[PDB]
Protein backbone atom coordinates (compact mmCIF):
# COMPACT_ATOMS: atom_id res chain seq x y z
CA UNK A 1 0.00 0.00 0.00
CA UNK A 2 2.30 2.74 -1.27
CA UNK A 3 1.40 6.39 -0.79
CA UNK A 4 -1.32 7.62 -3.13
CA UNK A 5 -0.35 9.78 -6.10
CA UNK A 6 -1.75 12.89 -4.41
CA UNK A 7 0.34 12.27 -1.28
CA UNK A 8 3.42 11.36 -3.34
CA UNK A 9 3.25 14.73 -5.11
CA UNK A 10 2.69 16.50 -1.79
CA UNK A 11 5.83 14.87 -0.38
CA UNK A 12 7.98 15.76 -3.39
CA UNK A 13 6.82 19.39 -3.40
CA UNK A 14 7.78 19.59 0.28
CA UNK A 15 11.30 18.33 -0.46
CA UNK A 16 11.75 21.06 -3.07
CA UNK A 17 10.66 23.53 -0.40
CA UNK A 18 13.52 22.40 1.84
CA UNK A 19 16.03 22.31 -1.04
CA UNK A 20 18.18 25.17 0.39
CA UNK A 21 18.26 23.33 3.72
CA UNK A 22 19.34 20.08 2.06
CA UNK A 23 22.17 21.80 0.18
CA UNK A 24 23.42 23.87 3.11
CA UNK A 25 23.21 21.07 5.70
CA UNK A 26 23.23 17.62 4.06
CA UNK A 27 25.79 18.32 1.32
CA UNK A 28 29.36 19.51 0.73
CA UNK A 29 28.30 23.13 0.17
CA UNK A 30 29.12 24.35 3.69
CA UNK A 31 32.73 23.14 3.84
CA UNK A 32 33.65 24.60 0.44
CA UNK A 33 31.99 27.93 1.28
CA UNK A 34 33.80 28.25 4.62
CA UNK A 35 37.22 27.37 3.18
CA UNK A 36 36.75 29.96 0.43
CA UNK A 37 35.72 32.47 3.10
CA UNK A 38 38.87 31.86 5.17
CA UNK A 39 41.08 32.11 2.08
CA UNK A 40 39.50 35.41 1.04
CA UNK A 41 40.08 36.90 4.50
CA UNK A 42 43.60 35.41 4.58
CA UNK A 43 44.69 37.77 1.80
CA UNK A 44 44.41 41.54 1.87
CA UNK A 45 41.28 41.50 -0.29
CA UNK A 46 38.14 41.93 1.79
CA UNK A 47 35.37 40.98 -0.67
CA UNK A 48 37.09 41.19 -4.06
CA UNK A 49 35.96 37.68 -5.18
CA UNK A 50 32.40 38.75 -4.19
CA UNK A 51 29.84 36.56 -2.42
CA UNK A 52 27.84 35.50 -5.48
CA UNK A 53 30.93 34.18 -7.28
CA UNK A 54 32.08 32.25 -4.20
CA UNK A 55 28.68 30.57 -3.85
CA UNK A 56 28.52 30.06 -7.62
CA UNK A 57 31.84 28.21 -7.59
CA UNK A 58 30.78 26.17 -4.55
CA UNK A 59 27.46 25.17 -6.15
CA UNK A 60 29.23 23.67 -9.17
CA UNK A 61 31.84 21.99 -6.96
CA UNK A 62 29.24 20.52 -4.60
CA UNK A 63 27.31 19.20 -7.61
CA UNK A 64 30.38 17.50 -9.09
CA UNK A 65 31.60 15.85 -5.88
CA UNK A 66 28.07 14.55 -5.18
CA UNK A 67 27.46 13.26 -8.71
CA UNK A 68 28.31 9.67 -7.61
CA UNK A 69 25.71 9.69 -4.83
CA UNK A 70 23.29 11.55 -7.11
CA UNK A 71 23.71 8.82 -9.73
CA UNK A 72 23.33 6.11 -7.08
CA UNK A 73 20.00 7.66 -6.08
CA UNK A 74 18.93 7.67 -9.73
CA UNK A 75 20.07 4.11 -10.47
CA UNK A 76 18.55 2.59 -7.31
CA UNK A 77 15.57 4.78 -6.37
CA UNK A 78 14.44 6.82 -9.38
CA UNK A 79 14.65 4.44 -12.35
CA UNK A 80 13.06 1.48 -10.48
CA UNK A 81 10.37 3.90 -9.30
CA UNK A 82 9.65 5.19 -12.81
CA UNK A 83 9.71 1.66 -14.27
CA UNK A 84 7.07 0.54 -11.73
CA UNK A 85 9.37 -1.86 -9.89
CA UNK A 86 9.51 -0.55 -6.30
CA UNK A 87 6.92 0.75 -3.86
CA UNK A 88 7.13 4.52 -3.44
CA UNK A 89 7.93 3.95 0.23
CA UNK A 90 10.77 1.63 -0.81
CA UNK A 91 12.04 4.12 -3.39
CA UNK A 92 12.24 6.84 -0.74
CA UNK A 93 14.34 4.53 1.43
CA UNK A 94 16.49 3.60 -1.57
CA UNK A 95 17.20 7.29 -2.17
CA UNK A 96 17.97 8.05 1.49
CA UNK A 97 20.46 5.19 1.93
CA UNK A 98 23.31 6.53 -0.29
CA UNK A 99 22.87 10.01 1.20
CA UNK A 100 23.24 8.62 4.73
CA UNK A 101 26.31 6.61 3.71
CA UNK A 102 28.01 9.67 2.19
CA UNK A 103 27.38 11.76 5.31
CA UNK A 104 28.85 9.00 7.49
CA UNK A 105 32.09 8.93 5.50
CA UNK A 106 32.67 12.64 6.27
CA UNK A 107 31.58 12.66 9.92
CA UNK A 108 33.53 12.28 13.15
CA UNK A 109 32.69 9.60 15.71
CA UNK A 110 32.87 12.21 18.49
CA UNK A 111 30.10 14.17 16.75
CA UNK A 112 27.93 11.05 16.55
CA UNK A 113 28.68 10.17 20.18
CA UNK A 114 27.56 13.53 21.58
CA UNK A 115 24.39 13.78 19.47
CA UNK A 116 23.32 10.18 20.11
CA UNK A 117 23.61 10.83 23.85
CA UNK A 118 21.85 14.17 23.31
CA UNK A 119 18.94 12.44 21.56
CA UNK A 120 18.95 9.76 24.27
CA UNK A 121 18.44 6.76 21.97
CA UNK A 122 20.08 3.38 22.58
CA UNK A 123 21.88 2.72 19.29
CA UNK A 124 25.28 1.04 18.99
CA UNK A 125 26.19 0.56 15.33
CA UNK A 126 27.18 3.84 13.59
CA UNK A 127 25.08 3.09 10.51
CA UNK A 128 21.43 2.92 11.70
CA UNK A 129 21.31 6.36 13.31
CA UNK A 130 18.43 8.68 12.46
CA UNK A 131 18.76 11.59 10.06
CA UNK A 132 17.68 13.84 12.93
CA UNK A 133 20.91 12.88 14.70
CA UNK A 134 23.16 12.42 11.65
CA UNK A 135 22.60 15.85 10.07
CA UNK A 136 23.75 17.96 13.07
CA UNK A 137 26.71 15.61 13.49
CA UNK A 138 27.60 15.94 9.80
CA UNK A 139 27.39 19.73 9.65
CA UNK A 140 29.42 19.98 12.87
CA UNK A 141 32.13 17.79 11.33
CA UNK A 142 32.11 19.87 8.13
CA UNK A 143 32.62 23.11 10.07
CA UNK A 144 35.55 21.66 12.02
CA UNK A 145 37.12 20.19 8.88
CA UNK A 146 36.76 23.52 7.06
CA UNK A 147 38.55 25.32 9.91
CA UNK A 148 41.46 22.87 9.69
CA UNK A 149 41.79 23.43 5.94
CA UNK A 150 41.34 27.17 6.43
CA UNK A 151 44.18 27.28 8.96
CA UNK A 152 46.35 25.24 6.57
CA UNK A 153 45.89 27.75 3.74
CA UNK A 154 46.25 30.74 6.09
CA UNK A 155 49.80 29.91 7.24
CA UNK A 156 51.68 30.81 4.01
CA UNK A 157 49.93 34.19 3.90
CA UNK A 158 50.86 34.75 7.55
CA UNK A 159 54.48 33.94 6.64
CA UNK A 160 54.51 36.60 3.92
CA UNK A 161 52.89 39.17 6.21
CA UNK A 162 55.46 38.63 8.98
CA UNK A 163 58.42 38.72 6.57
CA UNK A 164 57.29 41.99 4.98
CA UNK A 165 56.69 43.58 8.39
CA UNK A 166 60.06 42.34 9.66
CA UNK A 167 61.93 43.62 6.60
CA UNK A 168 60.26 47.03 6.84
CA UNK A 169 61.07 47.22 10.56
CA UNK A 170 64.68 46.30 9.74
CA UNK A 171 65.05 49.48 7.67
CA UNK A 172 63.49 51.56 10.47
CA UNK A 173 60.44 52.63 8.44
CA UNK A 174 58.01 51.68 11.19
CA UNK A 175 55.46 54.21 9.92
CA UNK A 176 54.98 52.30 6.65
CA UNK A 177 51.96 49.99 6.75
CA UNK A 178 52.98 46.37 6.02
CA UNK A 179 49.54 45.45 4.63
CA UNK A 180 49.70 47.62 1.49
CA UNK A 181 53.09 46.18 0.48
CA UNK A 182 52.27 42.62 1.59
CA UNK A 183 49.20 42.26 -0.66
CA UNK A 184 50.94 42.08 -4.10
CA UNK A 185 53.20 39.33 -2.77
CA UNK A 186 50.15 37.45 -1.48
CA UNK A 187 48.66 37.69 -4.97
CA UNK A 188 52.07 36.77 -6.39
CA UNK A 189 52.45 33.55 -4.39
CA UNK A 190 48.85 32.43 -4.96
CA UNK A 191 49.08 32.85 -8.74
CA UNK A 192 52.45 31.23 -9.49
CA UNK A 193 51.41 28.30 -7.27
CA UNK A 194 48.22 28.04 -9.39
CA UNK A 195 46.12 28.48 -6.28
CA UNK A 196 42.60 28.57 -7.72
CA UNK A 197 42.97 25.29 -9.60
CA UNK A 198 44.87 23.78 -6.66
CA UNK A 199 42.37 24.62 -3.91
CA UNK A 200 39.30 23.51 -5.87
CA UNK A 201 41.03 20.24 -6.76
CA UNK A 202 41.93 19.61 -3.11
CA UNK A 203 38.41 20.51 -1.97
CA UNK A 204 37.04 18.09 -4.56
CA UNK A 205 39.47 15.40 -3.43
CA UNK A 206 38.85 16.13 0.25
CA UNK A 207 35.40 14.47 0.19
CA UNK A 208 36.40 10.81 0.21
CA UNK B 1 8.28 18.65 -31.54
CA UNK B 2 9.03 22.35 -31.15
CA UNK B 3 8.11 23.89 -27.81
CA UNK B 4 4.67 25.47 -27.62
CA UNK B 5 4.25 29.23 -27.25
CA UNK B 6 3.28 28.82 -23.59
CA UNK B 7 6.39 26.75 -22.84
CA UNK B 8 8.73 29.08 -24.74
CA UNK B 9 7.47 32.02 -22.66
CA UNK B 10 8.16 30.05 -19.47
CA UNK B 11 11.74 29.40 -20.60
CA UNK B 12 12.20 33.08 -21.51
CA UNK B 13 11.09 34.29 -18.07
CA UNK B 14 13.33 31.69 -16.41
CA UNK B 15 16.46 33.01 -18.14
CA UNK B 16 15.52 36.56 -17.12
CA UNK B 17 15.40 35.41 -13.50
CA UNK B 18 18.90 33.94 -13.83
CA UNK B 19 20.16 37.00 -15.74
CA UNK B 20 22.38 38.31 -12.87
CA UNK B 21 24.08 34.90 -12.74
CA UNK B 22 24.84 34.89 -16.47
CA UNK B 23 26.52 38.30 -16.16
CA UNK B 24 28.76 37.38 -13.22
CA UNK B 25 29.47 33.74 -14.16
CA UNK B 26 29.51 33.61 -17.98
CA UNK B 27 30.43 37.10 -19.21
CA UNK B 28 33.53 39.20 -18.48
CA UNK B 29 32.01 40.91 -15.42
CA UNK B 30 34.03 38.90 -12.89
CA UNK B 31 37.45 39.78 -14.33
CA UNK B 32 36.72 43.50 -14.68
CA UNK B 33 35.38 43.91 -11.14
CA UNK B 34 38.27 41.99 -9.57
CA UNK B 35 40.82 44.07 -11.50
CA UNK B 36 39.02 47.30 -10.57
CA UNK B 37 38.89 46.02 -6.98
CA UNK B 38 42.69 45.79 -6.97
CA UNK B 39 43.01 49.31 -8.40
CA UNK B 40 40.89 50.78 -5.61
CA UNK B 41 42.79 48.73 -3.02
CA UNK B 42 46.20 49.67 -4.44
CA UNK B 43 45.64 53.40 -4.00
CA UNK B 44 45.19 54.85 -0.53
CA UNK B 45 41.44 55.25 -1.08
CA UNK B 46 39.43 52.55 0.71
CA UNK B 47 35.81 53.18 -0.35
CA UNK B 48 36.29 56.49 -2.17
CA UNK B 49 35.30 55.33 -5.70
CA UNK B 50 32.29 53.62 -4.02
CA UNK B 51 30.79 50.30 -5.11
CA UNK B 52 28.05 51.76 -7.31
CA UNK B 53 30.17 53.38 -10.03
CA UNK B 54 32.56 50.42 -10.25
CA UNK B 55 29.74 48.00 -11.05
CA UNK B 56 28.18 50.50 -13.45
CA UNK B 57 31.46 51.00 -15.30
CA UNK B 58 32.01 47.23 -15.26
CA UNK B 59 28.55 46.66 -16.75
CA UNK B 60 29.24 49.13 -19.55
CA UNK B 61 32.69 47.61 -20.12
CA UNK B 62 31.13 44.14 -20.39
CA UNK B 63 28.54 45.33 -22.91
CA UNK B 64 31.45 46.77 -24.89
CA UNK B 65 33.50 43.56 -24.92
CA UNK B 66 30.47 41.25 -25.19
CA UNK B 67 29.15 43.24 -28.16
CA UNK B 68 30.79 40.90 -30.75
CA UNK B 69 29.40 37.78 -29.06
CA UNK B 70 26.02 39.39 -28.33
CA UNK B 71 25.72 40.49 -31.97
CA UNK B 72 26.72 36.98 -33.09
CA UNK B 73 23.91 35.58 -30.93
CA UNK B 74 21.54 38.20 -32.36
CA UNK B 75 22.33 37.33 -35.98
CA UNK B 76 22.56 33.54 -35.70
CA UNK B 77 19.78 32.87 -33.18
CA UNK B 78 17.42 35.83 -32.73
CA UNK B 79 17.00 36.76 -36.40
CA UNK B 80 15.97 33.29 -37.68
CA UNK B 81 13.72 32.89 -34.63
CA UNK B 82 11.99 36.26 -35.09
CA UNK B 83 11.47 35.54 -38.80
CA UNK B 84 10.19 32.04 -37.87
CA UNK B 85 12.96 30.52 -39.99
CA UNK B 86 14.01 28.00 -37.31
CA UNK B 87 12.32 26.30 -34.38
CA UNK B 88 12.80 27.31 -30.75
CA UNK B 89 14.91 24.27 -29.82
CA UNK B 90 17.57 24.91 -32.47
CA UNK B 91 17.44 28.68 -31.90
CA UNK B 92 18.31 28.12 -28.23
CA UNK B 93 21.25 25.94 -29.27
CA UNK B 94 22.30 28.55 -31.83
CA UNK B 95 22.40 31.13 -29.02
CA UNK B 96 24.26 28.86 -26.59
CA UNK B 97 27.15 28.16 -28.98
CA UNK B 98 28.63 31.71 -29.17
CA UNK B 99 28.64 31.88 -25.37
CA UNK B 100 30.46 28.53 -25.24
CA UNK B 101 33.01 29.71 -27.82
CA UNK B 102 33.69 32.92 -25.88
CA UNK B 103 34.18 31.01 -22.62
CA UNK B 104 36.65 28.69 -24.37
CA UNK B 105 38.66 31.70 -25.57
CA UNK B 106 39.09 32.88 -21.95
CA UNK B 107 39.86 29.54 -20.26
CA UNK B 108 42.94 27.36 -19.87
CA UNK B 109 43.53 23.74 -20.83
CA UNK B 110 44.61 22.77 -17.31
CA UNK B 111 41.40 24.18 -15.81
CA UNK B 112 39.23 22.22 -18.24
CA UNK B 113 41.14 19.00 -17.52
CA UNK B 114 40.62 19.33 -13.76
CA UNK B 115 36.85 19.81 -14.00
CA UNK B 116 36.21 17.26 -16.76
CA UNK B 117 37.94 14.64 -14.61
CA UNK B 118 36.08 16.04 -11.59
CA UNK B 119 32.73 15.58 -13.36
CA UNK B 120 33.68 11.97 -14.15
CA UNK B 121 32.55 12.15 -17.77
CA UNK B 122 34.05 11.07 -21.10
CA UNK B 123 35.07 13.60 -23.76
CA UNK B 124 37.82 14.04 -26.34
CA UNK B 125 37.21 17.51 -27.83
CA UNK B 126 37.06 20.72 -25.75
CA UNK B 127 34.61 22.14 -28.31
CA UNK B 128 31.70 19.88 -27.27
CA UNK B 129 32.07 19.88 -23.48
CA UNK B 130 28.91 20.60 -21.51
CA UNK B 131 28.39 24.19 -20.39
CA UNK B 132 27.78 22.94 -16.84
CA UNK B 133 31.46 21.96 -16.66
CA UNK B 134 32.77 24.90 -18.72
CA UNK B 135 31.40 27.51 -16.29
CA UNK B 136 33.51 26.54 -13.22
CA UNK B 137 36.61 26.28 -15.42
CA UNK B 138 35.86 29.66 -17.02
CA UNK B 139 35.59 31.64 -13.78
CA UNK B 140 38.56 29.81 -12.24
CA UNK B 141 40.65 30.95 -15.21
CA UNK B 142 39.10 34.43 -14.94
CA UNK B 143 40.05 34.77 -11.26
CA UNK B 144 43.63 33.67 -11.96
CA UNK B 145 43.88 36.01 -14.95
CA UNK B 146 42.46 38.92 -12.95
CA UNK B 147 44.98 38.35 -10.15
CA UNK B 148 47.77 38.47 -12.74
CA UNK B 149 46.56 41.81 -14.10
CA UNK B 150 45.92 43.15 -10.60
CA UNK B 151 49.41 42.13 -9.50
CA UNK B 152 50.90 44.05 -12.43
CA UNK B 153 48.72 47.06 -11.58
CA UNK B 154 49.77 46.88 -7.92
CA UNK B 155 53.52 47.05 -8.67
CA UNK B 156 53.78 50.71 -9.84
CA UNK B 157 51.86 51.94 -6.80
CA UNK B 158 54.08 49.83 -4.54
CA UNK B 159 57.07 51.30 -6.39
CA UNK B 160 55.94 54.87 -5.67
CA UNK B 161 55.20 54.17 -2.00
CA UNK B 162 58.57 52.51 -1.35
CA UNK B 163 60.45 55.39 -3.01
CA UNK B 164 58.66 58.02 -0.91
CA UNK B 165 59.27 56.06 2.30
CA UNK B 166 62.97 55.67 1.48
CA UNK B 167 63.31 59.38 0.67
CA UNK B 168 61.68 60.43 3.95
CA UNK B 169 63.81 58.01 5.97
CA UNK B 170 66.97 59.11 4.15
CA UNK B 171 66.21 62.76 4.93
CA UNK B 172 66.13 61.72 8.60
CA UNK B 173 62.44 62.36 9.38
CA UNK B 174 61.62 58.94 10.84
CA UNK B 175 58.40 60.44 12.26
CA UNK B 176 56.26 61.11 9.17
CA UNK B 177 53.94 58.46 7.75
CA UNK B 178 54.73 57.79 4.06
CA UNK B 179 51.06 57.24 3.14
CA UNK B 180 49.95 60.88 3.37
CA UNK B 181 52.84 62.15 1.24
CA UNK B 182 52.68 59.29 -1.27
CA UNK B 183 48.94 59.54 -1.96
CA UNK B 184 49.04 62.74 -4.10
CA UNK B 185 52.06 61.39 -5.99
CA UNK B 186 50.23 58.13 -6.74
CA UNK B 187 47.16 60.09 -7.85
CA UNK B 188 49.18 62.60 -9.90
CA UNK B 189 51.05 59.81 -11.70
CA UNK B 190 47.73 58.04 -12.23
CA UNK B 191 46.32 61.11 -14.00
CA UNK B 192 49.17 62.53 -16.10
CA UNK B 193 49.71 59.10 -17.69
CA UNK B 194 45.93 58.68 -18.18
CA UNK B 195 46.04 55.42 -16.28
CA UNK B 196 42.43 54.33 -16.75
CA UNK B 197 42.64 54.57 -20.55
CA UNK B 198 45.71 52.31 -20.45
CA UNK B 199 43.85 49.90 -18.16
CA UNK B 200 40.91 49.90 -20.58
CA UNK B 201 43.19 48.89 -23.45
CA UNK B 202 44.81 46.06 -21.47
CA UNK B 203 41.48 44.85 -20.04
CA UNK B 204 39.01 45.15 -22.93
CA UNK B 205 41.63 43.89 -25.38
CA UNK B 206 42.76 41.09 -23.06
CA UNK B 207 39.86 38.90 -24.21
CA UNK B 208 40.02 39.16 -28.03
Amino acid sequence: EDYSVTLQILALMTMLGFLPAMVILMTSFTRIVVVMSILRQAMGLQQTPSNQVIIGIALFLTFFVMSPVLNEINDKAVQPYLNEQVTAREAFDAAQAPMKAFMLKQTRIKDLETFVTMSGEQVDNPEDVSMAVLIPAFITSELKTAFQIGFMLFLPFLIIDLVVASVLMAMGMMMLSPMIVSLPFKLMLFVLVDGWNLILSTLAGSFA
Amino acid sequence: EDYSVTLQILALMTMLGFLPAMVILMTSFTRIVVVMSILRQAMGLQQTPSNQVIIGIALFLTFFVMSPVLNEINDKAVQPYLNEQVTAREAFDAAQAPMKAFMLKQTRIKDLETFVTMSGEQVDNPEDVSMAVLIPAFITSELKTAFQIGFMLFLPFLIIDLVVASVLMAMGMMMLSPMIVSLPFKLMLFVLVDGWNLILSTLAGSFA
Binding site: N74 | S4, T6, L7
Partner: peptide
Amino acid sequence: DFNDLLTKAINNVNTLQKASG
Protein backbone atom coordinates in the same frame (compact mmCIF):
# COMPACT_ATOMS: atom_id res chain seq x y z
CA ASP C 1 20.97 9.70 -16.33
CA PHE C 2 20.13 12.45 -13.85
CA ASN C 3 20.80 15.13 -16.48
CA ASP C 4 18.27 13.55 -18.84
CA LEU C 5 15.62 13.57 -16.09
CA LEU C 6 14.81 17.25 -16.69
CA THR C 7 14.87 16.77 -20.47
CA LYS C 8 12.38 13.90 -20.33
CA ALA C 9 10.02 15.84 -18.04
CA ILE C 10 9.90 18.86 -20.36
CA ASN C 11 9.33 16.66 -23.42
CA ASN C 12 6.38 14.93 -21.74
CA VAL C 13 4.82 18.31 -20.93
CA ASN C 14 5.41 19.43 -24.52
CA THR C 15 3.85 16.21 -25.83
CA LEU C 16 0.83 16.62 -23.53
CA GLN C 17 0.41 20.22 -24.66
CA LYS C 18 0.87 19.23 -28.31
CA ALA C 19 -1.74 16.46 -28.11
CA SER C 20 -4.14 18.71 -26.20
CA GLY C 21 -3.81 21.50 -28.75
